[PDB]
A paper describes a structure:
The structure of the optimized genetically truncated thioesterase domain, which we refer to as SulTE, was determined. The protein has a typical α/β hydrolase fold with seven central β strands (β2 to β8) flanked by four α helices on one side and three helices on another side. The first strand of the canonical α/β hydrolase fold is missing and hence the structure starts with the second β-strand, which is anti-parallel to the remaining six strands. A very long sixth α-helix along with seventh helix and the following loop (residues 2860–2877) form the lid region. The active site residues of the [name] thioesterase domain, Cys2818, Asp2926, and His2956, form the catalytic triad where the central histidine is 3.2 Å and 2.7 Å from the cysteine and aspartic acid residues, respectively. The nucleophile Cys2818 is present at the turn following the β5 strand, while Asp2926 is located on the loop that follows the β7 strand and His2956 is positioned on the loop after β8 strand. Unlike the position of the aspartic acid residue on β6 (position I) seen in other NRPS TE domains, only ObiF1 (39) and SulTE reposition the aspartic acid residue to the loop following strand β7 referred as position II. The [name] thioesterase domain lid loop, which spans residues Gly2844 to Val2918, contains two helices. In the SulTE structure, the loop that follows the β7 strand runs from Gly2923 to Val2946 and contains an unusually long α-310 composite helix. The first two residues of this helix, Tyr2932 and Pro2933, adopt a traditional α-helical conformation while the following nine residues form a 310 helix.
Nonribosomal peptide synthetases (NRPSs) are responsible for the production of important biologically active peptides. The large, multidomain NRPSs operate through an assembly line strategy in which the growing peptide is tethered to carrier domains that deliver the intermediates to neighboring catalytic domains. The paradigm monobactam antibiotic sulfazecin is produced through the activity of a terminal thioesterase domain of [name], which catalyzes an unusual β-lactam–forming reaction in which the nitrogen of the C-terminal N-sulfo-2,3-diaminopropionate residue attacks its thioester tether to release the monobactam product. We have determined the structure of the thioesterase domain as both a free-standing domain and a didomain complex with the upstream holo peptidyl-carrier domain.
Residue numbers in the entry: 2727 to 2979
């Protein structure tokens, strides 16, 4: 019934915690390999994965309400589990919920010290809804290098969850763009790391656009993973665990 799951370390002995939001259509399972690397690459950091219930909602307003509910539930469970300094991690579309979680942690005066986002850039314009067909999505994801299920059952579940996560992230970022249009989005004094595979085709012009994360927090740091595409949790999970360890090192004081 908890919104989070302990995947590595032990909060009774750790020096910090990282709470992790999965890529589109993903969940804690997508972090298994990364978690297995944490004791070696990030010894002092315990790791929680966020469960994505994909609560049914009937409007953009209800989706935003759901983002708030889910982020609040994650903060509830995290702070109930640990007082340790916290790093928030997200891959790709999970960035939306990660931002919400980070902002709520800041609102609660929790000891949140960094935001680390893989394979995503800040959105500064109202987005476009996804009207592609299922075959169009699968062709696009295949070209981008995604892993895709072969069983039609798994394909249907994947496409449902992918469409849901894209809707959630579009609604949340559109909300942030609205706030920014009124000067109502406060930058938080939380450093931001943007981790990008140099061959990632979904973050165009990231060497310049990564700095847009400064609408969220500051300072902003870019780290490039040469030879890697968009799927950092699949193709260099040890490197991302190490990235979390490095963040902790940077914010440990
Ligand atoms: Na990935």
């Amino acid at each position: 019934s908890s919104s989070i799951v302990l995947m590595a370390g032990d909060p009774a002995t750790a020096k910090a915690v990282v709470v992790c939001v999965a890529n589109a259509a993903g969940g804690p399972v997508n972090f298994v390999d990364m978690s297995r690397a944490m004791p070696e690459q990030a010894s002092d950091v315990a790791m929680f994965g966020v469960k994505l219930p994909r609560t049914e909602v009937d409007s953009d307003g209800a989706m935003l309400e759901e983002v708030r509910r889910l982020s609040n539930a994650v903060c509830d469970d995290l702070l109930a589990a640990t007082d340790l300094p916290a790093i928030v991690f997200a891959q790709c579309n999970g960035s939306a919920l990660a931002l919400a979680i980070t902002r709520e942690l800041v609102r609660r005066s929790a000891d949140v010290r960094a935001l680390c986002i893989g394979g995503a850039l800040m959105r500064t314009v109202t987005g476009k809804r996804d009207t592609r067909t299922d075959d169009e999505i699968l062709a696009f994801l295949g070209k981008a290098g995604s892993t895709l299920p072969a069983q039609p059952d798994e394909q249907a579940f994947f496409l449902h969850d992918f469409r849901y996560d894209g809707w959630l992230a579009d609604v949340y970022y559109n909300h942030l763009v609205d706030l920014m249009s009124r000067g109502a989005l406060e930058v938080v004094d939380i450093p931001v790391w943007c981790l990008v595979g140099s061959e990632d085709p979904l973050v165009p012009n990231y060497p310049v656009r990564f700095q847009d994360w400064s609408h969220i927090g500051r300072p902003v740091q870019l780290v490039e993973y040469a030879g890697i595409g968009h799927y950092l949790l699949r193709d260099c999970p040890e490197a991302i665990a190490r990235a979390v360890g490095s963040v902790w090192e940077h914010v440990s004081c």
